[PDB]
């Protein structure tokens, strides 16, 4: 691929320049190159990969939401639907790229629990971004893939990580949002957030307490 | 608009 | 090209949608398509074109400055140069797109003075951006092309527009910056900025409701640049 | 850091 002739260390170094430059597409493409070298990511490198793809997909999700809303409030001409479709298609390509990287290179039987949970959480997250724009039979397949990834990450985080670990927390947050906002299970959602928040206070004493606010903030919105 | 982690910005 | 099969009015509408969605690359691509239909732009459409490409090139210029000064803050290892050249090449690509549009479609002998001056100012501005990153013989041809575009715009604006016209001021502001920061002629910059600010002051009386917000704002930037430069 | 118009 495009990055095949570049040294792993140079790709990582360039991803960090791109971050400083706020060029998140270049950041992603550099990090995709690095992963394709076939060696494990360190903790720092995983976060470069996370941050770069989150920003790309973030922008695209926000644009999709603006367009869908203009489309809802206005239906009188195909233009808004066409452009929403186009943004939707680009969003889906990015998600497919991330999921390709996770399945082809990153998700392994081997490694730190933390690393395996990280990648399975990313997989549930990027299936959930797909589910946000999906309809019909495709949506149902995507929802089941999101669920199955998150559930697998949840199994690992509970057997191998402590209740205050930010990854385990973020994972349960996102999965609860999935339950409520995507999978139409408010019961499972609310239970997961409360149980997750509860088991966290019982081990308290940072990035831990943000995610604990968010579990409560969501719970407010939901009940 | 339920919040997810990590956040953007 | 790629927008060839779309209706002009649909391209304008999608450009406005790309603006709402803060997708400036998309918005630029849509306005390029509208321009390639060969019909003149309205005032509003000009403004869509300028906004789209200013945001695209504005992000590239800002990225280039970040990397440029990381490349100096350690001046080895070729990664910073290489990424800096890469952003540079993209920036030149966009400038060349805009200069091609102005030359092939937008700069004409006909039309109102606003439209003529606006396109020639854009021409000076986009040569100036190329100048910011050029070296050698390239730079000299680029600086000369920026000067000549600005000078022609200046000659029209003085003959055909009042001295508080925003396009006139904005032009004189950008040209003064070109003198100062690109042509290394700070006395020329200073005199143009002052002459300009003053002539505008001498007529702030004859200033339109809609123009007032813009003309005063730009007179303000002339004052801020003169402070920076004295 | 000279200002130009239009601003971003």
For residue A97, give the nearest of A7, A26, A172, A29 by alpha carbon.
A29
CB C128 within 8 A of CB C146: yes
CB A77 within 8 A of CB A48: no
CA end-to-end span of chain D: 14
In whole angstroms, what is the distance from residue A176 CA to residue B2 CA? 10
For residue C50, give the chain D residue with the closest CA: D6
In whole angstroms, what is the distance from residue C30 CA to residue C10 CA? 9
Q: Collect all residues of chain B within an 8 Å Cβ-Cβ radius of residue A55.
A: 8
In whole angstroms, what is the distance from residue C15 CA to residue B1 CA? 27
For residue C58, give the chain D residue with the closest CA: D8
Query: Residue C133, class by beta-carbon neighbours within 10 Å (0-12 exposed, 13-18 middle, 19+ buried)?
Result: buried
In whole angstroms, what is the distance from residue C222 CA to residue C199 CA? 12
Q: Which residue among A13, A63, A70 places its CB closest to the CB of C22?
A: A63
| CA A106 remoteness from chain centre | 14
Judge: D2–C180 Cβ closer than 8 Å, yes or no: yes
For residue A7, give the nearest of A29, A47, A46, A34 by alpha carbon.
A34
What are the distances in angstroms from CA A87 to CA A66, C14, C88, C94, C110? Answer: 11, 12, 27, 22, 38
In whole angstroms, what is the distance from residue C42 CA to residue C47 CA? 9
What is the nearest CA distance from A174 to chain C, expressed in angstroms? Answer: 25
| CA C213 remoteness from chain centre | 20
The count of domains in chain C is 1
3-state secondary structure chain C: CCCCCCCHHHHHHHHHHHHHCCCHHHHHHHHHHHHCCCCCCCHHHHHHHHHHHHHHHHHHHHHHHHHHHHHHCCCCCCHHHHHHHHHHHHHHHHHHHHHHHHHHHHCCCCCCHHHHHHHHHHHHHHHHHHHHHCCHHHHHHHHHHHHHHHHHHHHHHHHHCCCCCHHHHHHHHHHHHHHHHCCCCHHHHHHHHHHHHHHHHCCCCCCCHHHHHHHHHHHHHHHHHHHHHC
Q: Which of residues 200-229 of C touch D (CB under 8 A)?
A: 218, 221, 224-225, 228-229
| CA C219 remoteness from chain centre | 18
What's the sign of the alpha-carbon dihedral A181, A183, A185, A188? negative
Judge: D4–C218 Cβ closer than 8 Å, yes or no: no
Task: Say yes or no: A67 contacts chain C, CB-CB below 8 A.
Answer: yes
Q: Which range marks the domain in which residue C158 is found?
A: 1-230
In whole angstroms, what is the distance from residue C186 CA to residue C172 CA? 14
Q: Collect all residues of chain A within an 8 Å Cβ-Cβ radius of residue C82.
A: 14
In whole angstroms, how large is the CA radius of gyration of chain B?
A: 6
Dihedral angle of Cα A221, B4, B5, B9, to the nearest 10 degrees: -100
Indicate the resolution in Å. Answer: 2.3
In whole angstroms, what is the distance from residue C142 CA to residue C127 CA? 6
Residue burial A43-67, b: 16+ Cβ < 10 Å; e: rest: eebbebbbbbbbbbbebbbebbebb
Task: Say yes or no: C180 contacts chain D, CB-CB below 8 A.
Answer: yes
In whole angstroms, what is the distance from residue C132 CA to residue A22 CA? 20
Which residues, in sequence order, are CB contacts of C133 under 8 Å at separation 6+? C64, C88, C91, C92
The 3-state DSSP class for residue A205 equals: coil
CB A46 within 8 A of CB A115: yes
For residue A14, give the nearest of C76, C226, C50, C67 by alpha carbon.
C67
Q: Do chains A and C touch (3 or more CB pairs under 8 A)?
A: yes
For residue C40, give the nearest of C108, C124, C103, C122 by alpha carbon.
C108
Run of H or E including A199: helix A186-201
In whole angstroms, what is the distance from residue C23 CA to residue A84 CA? 12
Q: What is the CATH number of the domain that holds C48?
A: 1.20.190.20
């Amino acid at each position: 691929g495009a990055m095949g002739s570049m040294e792993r260390a140079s790709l990582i170094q360039k991803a960090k320049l791109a971050e400083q430059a706020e060029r998140y597409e270049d950041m992603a493409a550099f990090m995709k190159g690095a992963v394709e070298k076939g060696e494990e990511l360190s903790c720092e490198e995983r976060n470069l990969l996370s941050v770069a793809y989150k920003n790309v997909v973030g922008g695209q999700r926000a644009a999709w939401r603006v367009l869908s809303s203009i489309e809802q409030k206005s239906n009188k001409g195909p233009e808004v639907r066409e452009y929403r479709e186009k943004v939707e298609t680009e969003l889906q390509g990015v998600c497919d790229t991330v999921l390709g990287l996770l399945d082809s290179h990153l998700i392994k039987e081997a490694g730190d629990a933390e690393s395996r949970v990280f990648y399975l959480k990313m997989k549930g997250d990027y299936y959930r971004y797909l589910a946000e724009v999906a309809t019909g039979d495709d949506k149902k397949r995507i929802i089941d893939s999101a669920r199955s990834a998150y559930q697998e990450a949840m199994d690992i985080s509970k057997k191998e990580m402590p209740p205050t670990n930010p990854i385990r927390l973020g994972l349960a947050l996102n999965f609860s949002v999935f339950h409520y906002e995507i999978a139409n299970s408010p019961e499972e959602a609310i239970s997961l957030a409360k149980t997750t928040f509860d088991e966290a206070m019982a081990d308290l004493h940072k990035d831990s307490t943000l995610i604990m606010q968010l579990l409560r903030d969501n719970l407010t919105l939901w009940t | 608009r339920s919040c997810t982690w990590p956040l953007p910005r």
